[PDB]
Design a protein around this ligand. Structure first.
Ligand SMILES: C[C@@H]1NC(=O)[C@H](C2CCC2)OC(=O)C(C)(C)/C=C/c2ccc3ccc(nc3c2)[C@@H](C)NC(=O)[C@@H]2CCCN(N2)C1=O
Length: 165
């Protein structure tokens, strides 16, 4: 029987440790999308999220990250190539904690992702939901306080370490 993977991010604020956020990845529903995020979190392909930042945090909306090639929301790449397809839209944006793929149009998933801090149902069926925060929503809420209405962060929010549990 297969068990959904768990991954962790250790978050830092201007280089100062903040806490750990862990995620369940719904490999049972979106295996290809789950596997991308899993492998980018372990670094096992030779690239991934360790050291990258959350480039846009909008309080009461979402925290977005995963651009480890241009560091500002314009870059990123998947373990399958520069981009990969939308797998399915089985799972919906039901509330805070949902983990979902950022994109630039149909079938443009790469490495960027977002963590919901509110229900974002208008994104259903165009962003692939593939996971959820398991532990450490308090740390996501602490990260959120460094966001702003236009998404610029007031301190640098980084993934100091990440991997699989
Ligand atoms: C739609 C967005 N896509 C990207 O960020 C992709 C990247 C390349 C693959 C992912 O970047 C692009 O398309 C370009 C480089 C053209 C930048 C767009 C951009 C810039 C600043 C924004 C400021 C604010 C907003 N949207 C913004 C969107 C508000 C309204 N929405 C969001 O913050 C949503 C939340 C769900 C995740 N999420 N952002 C995305 O998936």
């Amino acid at each position: 029987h297969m068990v959904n993977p768990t991954v962790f991010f250790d978050i830092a604020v201007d280089g100062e440790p903040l806490g750990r956020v862990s995620f369940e990845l719904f490999a049972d529903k979106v295996p290809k999308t789950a596997e991308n995020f899993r492998a980018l979190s372990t670094g096992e392909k030779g690239f991934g999220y360790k050291g990258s930042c959350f480039h846009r945090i909008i309080p009461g909306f979402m925290c977005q990250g995963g651009d480890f090639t241009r560091h500002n929301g314009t870059g990123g790449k998947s373990i399958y190539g520069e981009k990969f397809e939308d797998e399915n839209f089985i799972l919906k944006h039901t509330g805070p904690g949902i983990l979902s793929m950022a994109n630039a149009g149909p079938n443009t998933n790469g490495s960027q992702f977002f963590i919901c801090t509110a229900k974002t149902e208008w994104l259903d069926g165009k962003h692939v939901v593939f996971g959820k925060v398991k532990e450490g929503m308090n740390i996501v809420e602490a990260m959120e306080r460094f966001g702003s209405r236009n998404g610029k962060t007031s301190k640098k929010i980084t993934i100091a370490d990440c991997g699989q549990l």
